[PDB]
């Protein structure tokens, strides 16, 4: 897609069985608990065009997903069947969708709406993980405001009732720092800038006390062989290993298989709780083989992941499974 992302867009959120307009002043901000529809009208190389992006937040329920399916069939038909359709889950957005918000980062809040509970209110202390990919696309994902949630590879924003902080990992890029600044503008708070290793007492206090967090040599490295995740499985009748692209999300770890995370200087073998013995044995064999064609191999179990592993994921919830 060569279009520059500056065409007219409309964004609706799924609320029960309806789609409901989102405040246009907040375009680029989404609730991870919800599902959205973006109708993007553009003009490129002489001709007009249309795309519908169906965006699914990582905590969106199965009924929201079914309701957007009907809602998109309705929109498609209202428009005469003219648009290009594309389904997208959180963290796997193509470049073109990321460009729609004017160089701003996509911001993803905790919470959302449901038929039962309505619109959740924002917490009074919130933490945001700001990560950008090789190509400069930036995502700011809200997580639980604990010290353990930090990782040296990224920038973070911390907003309390009384103060705001912009924490900067040793490994954080300039695109991640810029993105944190833009989140801070949307939050209407002015930051105290904080480098990793020289945090003020107020920063730790606001996170609930100082603690160990997600770090390693590789996570700390600025230079960036950026890490690769693989799914290993014998569910089809034989053992195979395929790559999982896009941002590393916790949903990508298949709980009935074994996963390999290659951070170059190390290889993690994550073992799903419903994976079979043979999947782990063969994955250990394949990792060892891949390494020797040119390094610790660390085995980790679902629910008992060390911080060196978890730091590579964009958002982690300890009560996800
Ligand atoms: Ca929801
Ligand atoms: Ca980073
Ligand atoms: Ca399996």
107 vs 125: CA distance, rounded Å = 17
**Pair (265, 277) in one structural domain:** yes
Distance 158 CA to ligand 1 centre (A): 24
Of 235, 295, 244, 241, residue with least CA distance to 268: 295
Please, are residues 257 and 232 in contact by the beta-carbon 8 Å criterion? yes
Q: Name the token pair of 238.
A: 């034989």
The burial class, CB within 10 Å (0-12 / 13-18 / 19+), for 234 is middle
Neighbours of ion ligand 2 (CB under 5 A): 153-154
**Pair (237, 311) in one structural domain:** yes
Helices vs. strands in the chain: H and E counts, helices first:
7, 17
**Pair (134, 113) in one structural domain:** no
DSSP helix/strand/coil, 33: coil
Q: What angle do CA 53, 57, 61 make, to 5 degrees?
A: 115
221 vs 169: CA distance, rounded Å = 10
7 is in an annotated binding site: no
Ligand nearest to the CA of 177: 2
DSSP helix/strand/coil, 298: strand
**Pair (117, 1) in one structural domain:** yes
**Which runs of consecutive H residues, i.e. helices, occur in the chain?**
62-78, 95-99, 174-187, 201-206, 217-220, 277-292, 307-310
208 is in an annotated binding site: no
318 is in an annotated binding site: no
Distance 194 CA to ligand 1 centre (A): 34
Please, are residues 222 and 153 in contact by the beta-carbon 8 Å criterion? no
Please, are residues 268 and 280 in contact by the beta-carbon 8 Å criterion? no
78 is in an annotated binding site: no
Q: Last residue of a domain, which of 84, 106, 121? A: 121
Q: Find where tokens 């002015």 sit.
A: 190
Q: Give the Cβ contact number of residue 211 at 10 Å.
A: 12
- Gaps in the chain (C to N over 2.5 angstroms) fall after 224, 294
279 is in an annotated binding site: yes
Distance 283 CA to ligand 1 centre (A): 36
Distance 135 CA to ligand 2 centre (A): 12
Q: Name the token pair of 149.
A: 């949630």
153 is in an annotated binding site: yes
184 vs 13: CA distance, rounded Å = 24
Q: Give the Cβ contact number of residue 66 at 10 Å.
A: 13
Distance 180 CA to ligand 1 centre (A): 25
277 vs 268: CA distance, rounded Å = 17
64 is in an annotated binding site: yes
- Determine if residue 52 is left, alpha or beta; phi over 0 gives left, psi from -120 to 50 gives alpha, anything else beta: beta
CATH number of the domain that residue 69 is part of:
3.40.20.10
Backbone angles phi, psi at 176, to 5 degrees: -75, -35
In Å, how far are 22, 106, 138, 144, 177 from 29, measured between CA atoms?
9, 6, 12, 18, 18
> What are the residues whose beta carbons fall under 8 Å from the beta carbon of 88, sequence distance 6 or more?
53, 54, 55, 56, 94, 97
Please, are residues 32 and 142 in contact by the beta-carbon 8 Å criterion? yes
Distance 207 CA to ligand 2 centre (A): 21
Q: Find where tokens 């246009």 sit.
A: 24
Ligand nearest to the CA of 58: 1
Edge-to-edge strand order for the sheet containing 228-233? 240-244, 228-233, 258-262, 267-271, 297-301
**Pair (32, 75) in one structural domain:** yes
**Pair (222, 310) in one structural domain:** yes
Q: Give the Cβ contact number of residue 248 at 10 Å.
A: 19
Count the domains in the chain: 3
Q: Give the Cβ contact number of residue 182 at 10 Å.
A: 19
Ligand nearest to the CA of 237: 3
Ligand nearest to the CA of 31: 1
DSSP helix/strand/coil, 187: helix
**Pair (210, 238) in one structural domain:** no
Please, are residues 271 and 301 in contact by the beta-carbon 8 Å criterion? yes
Of 43, 80, 79, 72, residue with least CA distance to 55: 72
170 is in an annotated binding site: no
Q: Name the token pair of 146.
A: 């604990």
**Pair (23, 85) in one structural domain:** yes
Please, are residues 96 and 5 in contact by the beta-carbon 8 Å criterion? yes
**DSSP label of 226:** -
In order, the DSSP letters of 104-138 are PPEEEES----TTT-SPPPPSSEEEEEEE-TT--E
**Pair (167, 251) in one structural domain:** no
Ligand nearest to the CA of 255: 3
Q: Last residue of a domain, which of 61, 94, 121? A: 121
Residue 154 sits in which domain range?
122-216
Q: Dihedral of CA 167/98/108/119: which sign?
A: positive
Q: Give the Cβ contact number of residue 76 at 10 Å.
A: 15
**Pair (47, 141) in one structural domain:** no
Q: Last residue of a domain, which of 62, 96, 121? A: 121
Q: Tell me which long-range contacts 73-77 makes (C-beta under 8 A, separation of at least 24).
A: 75/19, 75/37, 75/39, 76/52
How far is C-alpha 106 from the geometric centre of its chain's CA atoms? Answer: 10
Distance 235 CA to ligand 3 centre (A): 5
Distance 54 CA to ligand 1 centre (A): 14
**Pair (88, 177) in one structural domain:** no
The burial class, CB within 10 Å (0-12 / 13-18 / 19+), for 313 is buried
**Pair (104, 127) in one structural domain:** no
């Amino acid at each position: 897609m060569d279009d520059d992302g500056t065409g007219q867009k409309q964004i609706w959120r799924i609320e029960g069985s309806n789609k409901v307009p989102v405040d246009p002043a907040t375009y680029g901000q989404f609730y991870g608990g919800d599902s959205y529809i973006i109708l993007y009208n553009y003009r490129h190389g002489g001709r007009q065009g249309q795309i519908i992006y169906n965006w699914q937040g990582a905590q969106s329920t199965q009924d929201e997903v079914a309701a957007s399916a009907i809602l998109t069939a309705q929109l498609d038909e209202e428009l005469g069947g003219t648009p290009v359709q594309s389904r997208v889950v959180q963290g796997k957005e193509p470049a073109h969708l990321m460009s729609l918000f004017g160089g701003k980062p996509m911001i993803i809040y905790k919470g959302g709406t449901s038929r039962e509970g309505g619109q959740t209110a924002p917490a009074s202390t919130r933490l945001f993980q700001v990560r950008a990919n090789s190509a400069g696309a930036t995502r700011a994902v809200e997580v639980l405001p604990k010290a353990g949630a930090l990782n040296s590879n990224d920038a973070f924003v911390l907003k309390t009732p009384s103060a705001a902080y912009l924490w900067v990992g040793t490994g954080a890029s300039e695109a991640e720092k810029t993105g944190a600044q833009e989140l801070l503008r949307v939050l209407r708070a002015q930051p105290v800038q904080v480098a990793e290793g020289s945090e003020p007492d107020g920063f730790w206090e606001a996170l609930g006390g100082k603690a160990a967090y997600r770090t390693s040599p590789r996570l700390k490295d600025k230079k960036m062989h950026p890490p690769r995740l693989f799914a290993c499985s014998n569910k089809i009748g034989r053992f195979v290993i395929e790559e999982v692209p896009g941002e590393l999300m916790q949903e990508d770890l298949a709980t009935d298989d074994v996963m390999l995370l290659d951070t170059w200087d190390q290889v993690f073998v994550w073992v799903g709780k419903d994976s079979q013995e043979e999947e782990k044995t063969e994955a250990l064999t394949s990792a060892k083989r891949y390494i020797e064609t040119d390094t610790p191999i660390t085995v980790v179990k679902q629910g008992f992941e060390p911080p060196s592993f978890v730091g590579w994921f964009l958002g982690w919830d300890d009560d996800y499974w």
